[PDB]
């Protein structure tokens, strides 16, 4: 019983990258049948599964690799905080990817899952396009120490790429925060309040995502399972430090946004007073005119207006005089 | 929360210590070396003139103003045998008051 919770079902893809000291094989595939042998290879291998909405593929991979049904359900579940579980035959980490889009004020998320099994690393994504391109290029072009190392270093590299993209998202949010502060100080316009609320919601989501991430990485380096070599423990430690940075930044950012609300939020009763005053001003000067128009417009078959020449100019002047008196009264007593 | 090791920021080279505050205008070292019957007050701008006061028998009060100059802080910490993490904490203004007991 495996069900898929998210809303991404557009595409499915698979690709294997088996790299060694001097030879690499990068095979793009369309079905799981090719990646079945990649369990007993001596060299590090990276399996990439895109579009897990086809639950059959992940079920087959988990059955072949011995992945527990519960953690398979965790893989399928898309609304879950990042978390790490250490098992004897593999270590299972699940993390979040973010993609802020400018000119839209919206934050999009995605769930990615890494499974380290001795000589291989499985990656489960949900859409075409990711943030692990630099690792791919470094493996392809032999532009680092990645080839010389095992699959645990691959896990380190992928988490490092995730943290770097977190930093990029932080840069984007920094630009948004600066422009929003300028707008709110210059002119607290109505759309700016909605923008600030959306920014606050995005920062709350980002905090609630990042904070379990540093716990995951702490569990990664501080108490290494036998799968992670003690030689690669310091590198993981570095990544932990980086998340610290992110967290602090987010916290600072959140603080700022809170201020951006209160400075606007409490000073609203002034708007209530202005609306009260406008309504009273244009209701206290026009109800009397309507009433006098009614009484002198009242039909009676008789009136003190049988001839009464120039009476209509008299009543128009009465209207004008009353209006002028009320205007002067409010000007002098300051309801305007 | 176990063991003390230098934190690694990703925007900096691995060992560099950075000043965090927003003041660069001042720098001055005031040494005040007193005793029961004497005291020497000595205001300077050379870091190398305060080093002999580490081994002074009498009490001495060194006051370095302008920690924005990280080289002076690093030199004083290196001479007085101060741990590099304590130096990073010294230069890190954005932190709460704290106390650490070392040997």
């Amino acid at each position: 019983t495996l069900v898929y919770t998210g809303k991404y079902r557009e595409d499915f893809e698979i690709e294997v990258m088996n790299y060694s000291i001097e030879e690499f094989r990068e095979f793009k595939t369309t079905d799981v049948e090719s990646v079945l042998p990649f369990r007993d290879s001596s060299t590090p291998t990276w399996i990439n599964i895109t579009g897990i909405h086809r639950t059959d593929v992940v079920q087959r991979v988990g059955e072949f690799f011995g992945i527990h049904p519960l953690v398979l359900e965790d893989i399928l579940n898309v609304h879950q905080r990042p978390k790490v579980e250490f098992f004897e035959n593999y270590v299972f980490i699940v993390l979040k990817m973010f993609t802020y889009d400018k000119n839209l004020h919206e934050l999009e998320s995605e769930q990615v899952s890494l499974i380290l099994t001795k000589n291989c690393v499985l990656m489960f994504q949900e859409k075409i396009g990711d943030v692990f391109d630099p690792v791919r290029e470094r493996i392809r072009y032999n532009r680092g120490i990645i080839r010389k190392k095992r699959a645990d270093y691959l896990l380190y590299s992928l988490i490092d790429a995730l943290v770097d993209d977190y930093f990029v998202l932080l840069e984007k949010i920094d630009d948004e925060i600066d422009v929003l502060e300028e707008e709110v100080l210059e002119r607290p316009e109505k759309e700016t309040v909605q923008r600030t609320h959306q920014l606050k919601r995005n920062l709350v989501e980002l905090r609630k995502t990042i904070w379990p991430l540093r716990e995951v990485l702490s569990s990664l380096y501080r108490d290494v399972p036998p799968l992670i070599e003690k030689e690669t423990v310091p590198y993981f430690r570095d990544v932990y430090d980086h998340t610290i940075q992110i967290a602090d930044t987010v916290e600072t950012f959140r603080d700022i946004v809170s201020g951006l609300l209160d400075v606007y939020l409490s000073s609203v009763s002034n708007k209530t007073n202005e609306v009260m005053k406008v309504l009273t001003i244009i209701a206290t000067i026009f109800m009397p005119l309507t009433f006098i128009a009614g009484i002198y417009g009242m039909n009676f078959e008789y009136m003190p207006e049988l001839r009464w020449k120039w009476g209509y100019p008299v009543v128009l002047a009465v209207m004008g005089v009353i209006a002028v008196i009320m205007v002067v009264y409010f000007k002098k007593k300051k309801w305007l | 929360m176990e063991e003390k090791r230098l934190s690694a920021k990703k925007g900096l080279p691995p060992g560099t210590l950075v000043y965090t505050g927003k003041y660069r205008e001042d720098f001055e070292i005031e040494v005040m070396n007193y005793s029961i019957e004497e005291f020497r007050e000595f205001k300077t701008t050379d870091v190398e003139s305060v080093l002999p006061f580490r081994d002074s028998s009498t009490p001495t009060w060194i006051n370095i103003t302008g920690i924005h100059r990280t080289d002076v802080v690093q030199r004083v910490g290196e001479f007085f045998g101060i741990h590099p993490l304590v130096l990073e904490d010294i230069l890190n203004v954005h932190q709460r008051p704290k106390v650490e007991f070392f040997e």
Partner: antibody
Amino acid sequence: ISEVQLVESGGGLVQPGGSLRLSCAASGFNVSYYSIHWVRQAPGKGLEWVASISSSSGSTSYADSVKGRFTISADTSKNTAYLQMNSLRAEDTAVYYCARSYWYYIWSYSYGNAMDYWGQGTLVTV
Amino acid sequence: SDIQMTQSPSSLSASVGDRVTITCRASQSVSSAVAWYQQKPGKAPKLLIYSASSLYSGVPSRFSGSRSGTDFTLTISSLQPEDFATYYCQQSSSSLITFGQGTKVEIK
């Protein structure tokens, strides 16, 4: 009282594909505690960053234009920074400046690097 | 790839006592790691402003820097005869520092 300054030498006429070793001797401060940058200024054009060395850890950054052929290093014994230029080009003729920088803090994640002291400059013609 | 800073105008002109504004646009997002330098013709560049708002110690307070999103402005409130030089941007968000085009300030 040290009168911080950077005196730079090594700029002379060379042939394309030739080799040069620009030297930047820094007086008034220690190279180990600061970052040293090199910058070009082609005659009539603007400033162009070239290389950067942090002698404390040897971490090195190069401009993409000169990457692969230039090499910046620093010796703390002589308190000097050397820029070795190989496989030069006729478009590389410029006035080279040596600069000292200090890192400053913007946010917990973001840092900034500002050059406060500069050298005189040396002409290198190819 | 590389963050590119573009300055406007490429050159301007003014008289002593005027107010001068130079604008600088970054292709990508640099948080506040932008610095403004002044270079007189034939001399080494001089640091004026760092972090887009802070001003280096020893420069007159007439120089001011501001940022709005990605746009960065350097403003001389009351230009003085010793302020007719070429002004440059710099971004140090990444290890690959890049400089702006450079705007000359002629005298009219």
